[PDB]
Design an enzyme around this catalytic site. Structure first.
Site, PDB file in Angstrom:
ATOM      1  N   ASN A 115      -2.443  10.245  38.732  1.00  0.00           N
ATOM      2  CA  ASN A 115      -1.156   9.969  38.070  1.00  0.00           C
ATOM      3  C   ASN A 115      -0.873  11.009  36.981  1.00  0.00           C
ATOM      4  OD1 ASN A 115      -0.901   8.697  35.178  1.00  0.00           O
ATOM      5  ND2 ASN A 115      -2.933   8.121  36.060  1.00  0.00           N
ATOM      6  N   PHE A 119       3.465   9.170  29.865  1.00  0.00           N
ATOM      7  CA  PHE A 119       3.809   8.199  28.794  1.00  0.00           C
ATOM      8  C   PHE A 119       5.289   7.805  28.872  1.00  0.00           C
ATOM      9  CE2 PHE A 119      -0.075  10.289  27.462  1.00  0.00           C
ATOM     10  CZ  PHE A 119      -0.849   9.210  27.083  1.00  0.00           C
ATOM     11  N   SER A 185      -5.104  10.633  26.949  1.00  0.00           N
ATOM     12  CA  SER A 185      -4.259  10.851  28.166  1.00  0.00           C
ATOM     13  C   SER A 185      -4.443  12.275  28.692  1.00  0.00           C
ATOM     14  CB  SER A 185      -2.806  10.589  27.925  1.00  0.00           C
ATOM     15  OG  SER A 185      -2.032  11.021  29.033  1.00  0.00           O
ATOM     16  N   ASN A 187      -2.191  13.767  30.361  1.00  0.00           N
ATOM     17  CA  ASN A 187      -0.778  14.064  30.742  1.00  0.00           C
ATOM     18  C   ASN A 187       0.144  14.121  29.514  1.00  0.00           C
ATOM     19  OD1 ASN A 187      -1.494  13.804  33.582  1.00  0.00           O
ATOM     20  ND2 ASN A 187      -1.442  11.572  33.245  1.00  0.00           N
ATOM     21  N   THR A 188      -0.365  14.551  28.349  1.00  0.00           N
ATOM     22  CA  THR A 188       0.446  14.998  27.177  1.00  0.00           C
ATOM     23  C   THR A 188      -0.284  16.170  26.505  1.00  0.00           C
ATOM     24  OG1 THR A 188       1.609  12.893  26.809  1.00  0.00           O
ATOM     25  CG2 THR A 188       1.403  14.318  24.907  1.00  0.00           C
ATOM     26  N   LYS A 225      -9.917   5.189  22.486  1.00  0.00           N
ATOM     27  CA  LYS A 225     -10.128   5.345  23.950  1.00  0.00           C
ATOM     28  C   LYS A 225     -10.357   6.829  24.242  1.00  0.00           C
ATOM     29  CE  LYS A 225      -8.269   4.140  28.485  1.00  0.00           C
ATOM     30  NZ  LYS A 225      -7.219   3.332  29.140  1.00  0.00           N
ATOM     31  N   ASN A 254     -10.761   6.755  29.951  1.00  0.00           N
ATOM     32  CA  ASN A 254      -9.476   7.113  30.591  1.00  0.00           C
ATOM     33  C   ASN A 254      -9.761   7.810  31.953  1.00  0.00           C
ATOM     34  OD1 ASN A 254      -6.607   7.675  30.855  1.00  0.00           O
ATOM     35  ND2 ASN A 254      -6.475   7.523  28.587  1.00  0.00           N
TER      36      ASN A 254
HETATM   37  C1  LIG Z   1      -1.023   4.773  37.058  1.00  0.00           C
HETATM   38  C2  LIG Z   1      -1.875   4.766  35.786  1.00  0.00           C
HETATM   39  C3  LIG Z   1      -1.320   4.750  34.530  1.00  0.00           C
HETATM   40  C4  LIG Z   1      -2.120   4.717  33.374  1.00  0.00           C
HETATM   41  N1  LIG Z   1      -1.512   4.735  32.152  1.00  0.00           N
HETATM   42  C5  LIG Z   1      -2.317   4.612  31.043  1.00  0.00           C
HETATM   43  C6  LIG Z   1      -1.744   4.541  29.682  1.00  0.00           C
HETATM   44  O1  LIG Z   1      -0.521   4.490  29.484  1.00  0.00           O
HETATM   45  N2  LIG Z   1      -2.666   4.467  28.679  1.00  0.00           N
HETATM   46  C7  LIG Z   1      -4.000   4.510  28.811  1.00  0.00           C
HETATM   47  O2  LIG Z   1      -4.766   4.442  27.807  1.00  0.00           O
HETATM   48  N3  LIG Z   1      -4.619   4.557  30.021  1.00  0.00           N
HETATM   49  C8  LIG Z   1      -3.764   4.623  31.111  1.00  0.00           C
HETATM   50  N4  LIG Z   1      -4.393   4.662  32.353  1.00  0.00           N
HETATM   51  C9  LIG Z   1      -5.833   4.672  32.519  1.00  0.00           C
HETATM   52  C10 LIG Z   1      -6.446   3.323  32.801  1.00  0.00           C
HETATM   53  O3  LIG Z   1      -6.241   2.469  31.658  1.00  0.00           O
HETATM   54  C11 LIG Z   1      -7.924   3.454  33.047  1.00  0.00           C
HETATM   55  O4  LIG Z   1      -8.552   3.988  31.843  1.00  0.00           O
HETATM   56  C12 LIG Z   1      -8.295   4.372  34.246  1.00  0.00           C
HETATM   57  O5  LIG Z   1      -7.277   4.307  35.259  1.00  0.00           O
HETATM   58  C13 LIG Z   1      -9.648   4.006  34.814  1.00  0.00           C
HETATM   59  O6  LIG Z   1      -9.720   2.686  35.372  1.00  0.00           O
HETATM   60  P1  LIG Z   1      -9.504   2.396  36.952  1.00  0.00           P
HETATM   61  O7  LIG Z   1     -10.444   3.319  37.705  1.00  0.00           O
HETATM   62  O8  LIG Z   1      -9.963   0.982  37.068  1.00  0.00           O
HETATM   63  O9  LIG Z   1      -8.005   2.580  37.232  1.00  0.00           O
HETATM   64  C14 LIG Z   1      -3.548   4.684  33.509  1.00  0.00           C
HETATM   65  C15 LIG Z   1      -4.148   4.689  34.781  1.00  0.00           C
HETATM   66  C16 LIG Z   1      -3.306   4.734  35.901  1.00  0.00           C
HETATM   67  C17 LIG Z   1      -3.990   4.699  37.244  1.00  0.00           C
HETATM   68  O1  LIG Z   2       1.173   8.025  31.102  1.00  0.00           O
HETATM   69  C1  LIG Z   2       0.280   8.645  31.677  1.00  0.00           C
HETATM   70  O2  LIG Z   2       0.450   9.668  32.397  1.00  0.00           O
HETATM   71  C2  LIG Z   2      -1.130   8.251  31.466  1.00  0.00           C
HETATM   72  C3  LIG Z   2      -1.625   7.984  30.223  1.00  0.00           C
HETATM   73  C4  LIG Z   2      -3.027   7.751  30.043  1.00  0.00           C
HETATM   74  O3  LIG Z   2      -3.591   7.522  28.960  1.00  0.00           O
HETATM   75  N1  LIG Z   2      -3.800   7.913  31.161  1.00  0.00           N
HETATM   76  C5  LIG Z   2      -3.336   8.205  32.428  1.00  0.00           C
HETATM   77  O4  LIG Z   2      -4.113   8.353  33.377  1.00  0.00           O
HETATM   78  N2  LIG Z   2      -1.991   8.409  32.519  1.00  0.00           N
END
Ligand SMILES: Cc1cc2nc3c(=O)[nH]c(=O)nc-3n(C[C@H](O)[C@H](O)[C@H](O)COP(=O)(O)O)c2cc1C
Ligand SMILES: O=C(O)c1cc(=O)[nH]c(=O)[nH]1
Ligand SMILES: NCC(=O)Nc1ccc(-n2nc(C(F)(F)F)cc2-c2ccc3c(ccc4ccccc43)c2)cc1
Length: 365
Positions: A115, A119, A185, A187-188, A225, A254
């Site tokens: 992804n 944000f 993140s 992606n910033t 985080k 993350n």
């Molecule tokens: C589509 C998507 C969007 C995410 N957006 C955020 C976010 O806004 N903030 C954040 O701290 N982590 C974000 N994450 C990370 C998840 O909170 C998590 O740390 C990461 O995906 C690992 O867990 P998983 O393997 O169970 O998905 C995002 C992950 C995905 C897949």
């Molecule tokens: O908004 C996102 O692109 C995003 C934020 C974040 O903390 N982690 C992630 O995988 N995506």
């Protein structure tokens, strides 16, 4: 394994994935969750799964990770799904659209997602009003062992990252059981690179001063985080700052900007953060390192590639007090939550643990 677990995993979710791009499927999942249109949670939480950490009771240690409910639209539906705690966000101070679409990609052969949302956020004021509408409902949930976390981000065009986080603490801190600051993140442009130790100390000092300024009933725990892509030096520096300032906990991890050898999905070379199975063991090893560097005195929420009780218990034994998941829900649907909880209870009994608490950091002993 239940009828729903197999039906969602083998039939419904693959069929829906064949009909819908991942961002459309996510939007429909959030709306259905917000409306309570989700299968009956057939798993009664046992006492073995209760955890006391971060000043709260957690009925079970399995939470929904940040990013699923970015704007606080589906919190009550997520408790109904069986999560022991919910984390919303990331929330940015001002509303922002995020990156152009498409910005999320399924790697089905890898049980992974990439992804680059960037944000996308309704912003602090919209999320503040959404959480205010259910503030007393949430107070009862928290009292009943179902806490709420809020993950804070910064705007793309911010000229002062620390002030963006301080605004989030002031606006949503009073509505949260815990707050999360990402140094992480993918992606910033600039977020992970405030690892510069004196700059991390300056940012977290400001965040903790703003948190300490809130009235006691409205004063949340503060967690950091982190990415799974930190150098050994970065991890040493974070452990040092977290102990020096009394940060309440860590979320580990993350998504990864790495591309482990062996990815098969056609979309493996898309820009963004990788989640799901290929992240799992990188995240577990990061937990293990951060637990050792903090002498087991700093609660860790373990996240990355959890889709089974074994995955959850490996992170708990490595040093996690709680775990979260997102990508597993994407592939297996709502039944995965009860699956993880049932499998984790069975494994705790098989390995001679009285409960989750007794297993936390067990590998280090
Ligand atoms: C589509 C998507 C969007 C995410 N957006 C955020 C976010 O806004 N903030 C954040 O701290 N982590 C974000 N994450 C990370 C998840 O909170 C998590 O740390 C990461 O995906 C690992 O867990 P998983 O393997 O169970 O998905 C995002 C992950 C995905 C897949
Ligand atoms: O908004 C996102 O692109 C995003 C934020 C974040 O903390 N982690 C992630 O995988 N995506
Ligand atoms: N009273 C019980 C009830 O109404 N149950 C119910 C169960 C499933 C659905 N539903 N119906 C469809 C379809 F295709 F028929 F329209 C799809 C689903 C469904 C599918 C996946 C998810 C959710 C809900 C959330 C979700 C979150 C994370 C990932 C996938 C999904 C709901 C609707 C209602």
């Amino acid at each position: 394994a239940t009828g729903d677990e197999r039906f969602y995993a083998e039939h419904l979710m693959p069929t829906l994935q064949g009909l819908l791009d991942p961002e459309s499927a996510h939007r429909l999942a959030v709306r259905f969750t917000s409306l309570g249109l989700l299968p009956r949670a057939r798993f009664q939480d046992s006492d073995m799964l209760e955890v006391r950490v971060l000043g709260h009771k957690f009925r079970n240690p399995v939470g929904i990770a940040a990013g699923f409910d970015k704007h606080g639209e589906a919190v009550d539906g997520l408790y109904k799904m069986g999560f022991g705690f919910v984390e919303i966000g990331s929330v940015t101070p001002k509303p922002q659209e995020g990156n152009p679409r498409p910005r999320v990609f399924r790697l089905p052969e890898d049980q992974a997602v990439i992804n680059r949302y960037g944000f996308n956020s309704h912003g602090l004021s919209v999320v503040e009003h959404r959480l205010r509408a259910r503030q007393q409902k949430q107070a009862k949930l928290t009292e009943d062992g179902l806490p709420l976390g809020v993950n804070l981000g910064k705007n793309k065009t911010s000229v002062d990252a620390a002030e963006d986080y301080a605004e989030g603490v002031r606006v949503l801190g009073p509505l949260a059981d815990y707050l999360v600051v990402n140094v992480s993140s993918p992606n910033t442009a600039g977020l992970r690179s405030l690892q510069g130790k004196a700059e991390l100390r300056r940012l977290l000092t400001k965040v903790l001063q703003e948190r300490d300024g809130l009235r006691r009933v409205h004063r949340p725990a503060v967690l950091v985080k982190i990415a799974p892509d930190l150098t050994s030096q970065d991890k040493e520096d974070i452990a040092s700052v977290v102990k020096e300032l009394g940060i309440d906990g860590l979320i580990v991890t993350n998504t990864t900007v790495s591309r482990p050898a062996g990815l098969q999905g056609a979309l493996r070379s898309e820009t963004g953060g990788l989640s799901g199975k290929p992240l799992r063991d990188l995240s577990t090893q990061t937990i293990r390192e951060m637990y050792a560097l903090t002498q087991g005195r700093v609660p860790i929420i373990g996240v990355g590639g959890v889709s089974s009780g074994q995955d959850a218990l490996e992170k708990i034994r490595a040093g996690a007090s709680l775990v979260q998941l997102y990508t597993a829900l994407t592939f297996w649907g709502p039944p995965v939550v009860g699956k993880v909880k049932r499998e984790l209870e069975a494994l705790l009994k098989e390995q001679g643990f009285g409960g989750v608490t007794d297993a936390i950091g067990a590998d280090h002993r």
